Amino acid sequence: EDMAKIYGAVAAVSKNVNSSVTYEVKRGTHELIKVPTIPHNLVLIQSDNGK
């Protein structure tokens, strides 16, 4: 029974090692909006008689 207890203690320590890590890298990634209409900012002015 004592040997069973000791081996369980040692086995638990041996399992405490760590395999790896995982993470997502996203810094600097910004979303893009979409612009439907091109701004022209033009106005046509005409005389009343069209001169």
């Binding site: 207890k5 000791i6 369980g8 638990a12 405490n16």
Partner: protein
Amino acid sequence: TSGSIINHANNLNKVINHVFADKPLISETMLKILTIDGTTGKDGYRNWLD
């Protein structure tokens, strides 16, 4: 190294926790010697194991 200190502390906590689950590995005769000072009994074995 701090790596050794951290690794030793966590590993020893697992050993102490395991040996006191179900039937304790150490007998009640030995626990009484370590408990006289005032420790709970888990700490006495932990201190002795160090």
